[PDB]
């Protein structure tokens, strides 16, 4: 069935799917959640939109599929490891009326010697602010 | 892994350790706009070998959350093409460990200002 198919493999259809239910996946802290077809980007991380507290990344297909998206590894290659997240980013702490927040900012350079560089630019352009085009 | 092997990973995928420390993997800490500012001398020297690394890493985002929560941009400059990101991760102020989490994060934020 649909829940047996992951990005790199399909399970035995007689087995239980190893995808987490939305009920279980939602018990993780927001930053540790993993979106899949069973627990989509909106469920895990909220709507895409223009406000500073909303994410802006992902077209309709990526939003619905999360890490099941056909090109997920080509996006995830730019996400930082935990060591790199705290190593590369400017980290701050803000206390606001909405709570206490760990802020992060940074920039990650694409490798222009990577043979896929041009396709990486096209793929990122397809998802950055993609919600502006949604019907 | 040796520094020579660990350094072959893309910067965003590197894992700092005692053999390939935070400065080697991610550059010197400092105040500039895209320069990292996090880590005291102990964390800089030890990276993920730092004994309290799990209490820091609990706040690092999965790849899915990084792209789900953050505001992402792309800039083309004379140095290359850069994926920019900003965001914020909410601490659970109801967690009984909240006060200690704040202490641990503050101990590393801008710690470099106190040492060469």
From Swiss-Prot, chain A:
In residue numbers, the region (Putative NLRP3 binding) covers 31-111
Taxonomically, the superkingdom here is: Viruses
User: What are the CoV N CTD domain coordinates in residue numbering?
Assistant: 20-135
Post-translational modification summary for this protein: ADP-ribosylated. The ADP-ribosylation is retained in the virion during infection.
Its subcellular locations are: Virion; Host cytoplasm; Secreted; Host extracellular space
State the residue spans of region: Dimerization: 29-132
Q: Where is this motif: Nuclear localization signal?
A: 27-35
The protein's job, in short, is:
Packages the positive strand viral genome RNA into a helical ribonucleocapsid (RNP) and plays a fundamental role during virion assembly through its interactions with the viral genome and membrane protein M. Plays an important role in enhancing the efficiency of subgenomic viral RNA transcription as well as viral replication. Attenuates the stress granules formation by reducing host G3BP1 access to host mRNAs under stress conditions. May block host chemokine function in vivo, facilitating viral replication and transmission. Acts by being secreted into the extracellular space where it competes to host chemokines for binding to host glycosaminoglycans (GAG).
Q: How does it assemble?
A: Homodimer, homotetramer, homooligomer with RNA. Both monomeric and oligomeric forms interact with RNA. Interacts with protein M. Interacts with protein E. Interacts with NSP3; this interaction serves to tether the genome to the newly translated replicase-transcriptase complex at a very early stage of infection. Interacts with host NLRP3 and ABHD8; these interactions disrupt the association between NLRP3 and ABHD8, increasing NLRP3 stability, ultimately leading to increased inflammasome activation.
- Give the record's family classification: Belongs to the betacoronavirus nucleocapsid protein family.
Q: What is the protein named?
A: Nucleoprotein
Per the record, the gene is N
